[PDB]
Design a protein around this nucleic acid. Structure first.
Ligand code: MG
Ligand code: MG
Ligand code: MG
Length: 155
RNA sequence: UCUGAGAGUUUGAUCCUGGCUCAGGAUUAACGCUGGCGGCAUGCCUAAUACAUGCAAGUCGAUCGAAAGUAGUAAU
């Protein structure tokens, strides 16, 4: 049940020797709402073929996501170009306080409570890039234990 | 135990810098349309401009002389 939601449908065009070749570009986010989420951008002469190719690309590149108590473990800033997205842990109940492309990514990943603010640009591809970068740099409290030789997070 | 939502807009199309505008609240508010009632609260932001008229700090005869009024033949 990998649900998918369009996050942007732009109208790109090149110029030839007379006229304008117009192709639709779609940005689809696919997520199983259990820890797997990917993004795919595709271009085609028509929306249906563009959507099919974008979903195919998105399903080809699926990253693995870990959730802690339904939220994000530690506050993180994802950077991608000039877009910086701040994610902050939230108590169980606030809901997803995100909006736009980031909100779509968080819902499709599985996370519930999440504090976000877009501190940079409003271009959907870079915000999604920043969101995925922020979520992928996250450190579990068990990897640092193997690293720092602590006691499975114990004080 | 706190705790943050974005979008539109330069270009044939894209990214960035960057300004403008909008989605939310708020007031000692005014205007247009309309208009039934009740519980709370507010009500010259301007000319510290000029003001009719009527009210807004008096009280004690158990401090004191006198006066006045009513009863009383008078004293009282
Ligand atoms: Mg020619
Ligand atoms: Mg234009
Ligand atoms: Mg507004």
């Amino acid at each position: 049940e990998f649900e998918e939601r369009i996050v942007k449908l732009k109208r790109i065009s090149k110029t030839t020797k007379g006229g304008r070749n117009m192709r639709f570009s779609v940005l689809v986010v696919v997520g199983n709402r259990k820890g797997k989420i990917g993004y795919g951008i595709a271009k085609a002469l028509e929306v249906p073929n563009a959507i099919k190719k974008a979903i195919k690309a998105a399903h080809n590149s699926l990253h693995t996501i870990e959730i802690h108590k339904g939220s994000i473990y530690h506050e993180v800033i994802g950077r991608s170009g000039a877009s910086r997205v701040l994610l902050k842990p939230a108590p169980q109940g606030t809901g997803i306080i995100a909006g736009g492309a980031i909100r779509a990514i968080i819902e499709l990943a599985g996370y519930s409570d999440i504090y976000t603010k877009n501190l940079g640009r409003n271009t959907p591809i870079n915000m999604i890039h920043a969101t995925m970068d922020g979520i992928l740099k996250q450190l579990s409290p068990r990897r640092v234990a193997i690293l720092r030789n602590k006691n499975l997070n114990e004080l």
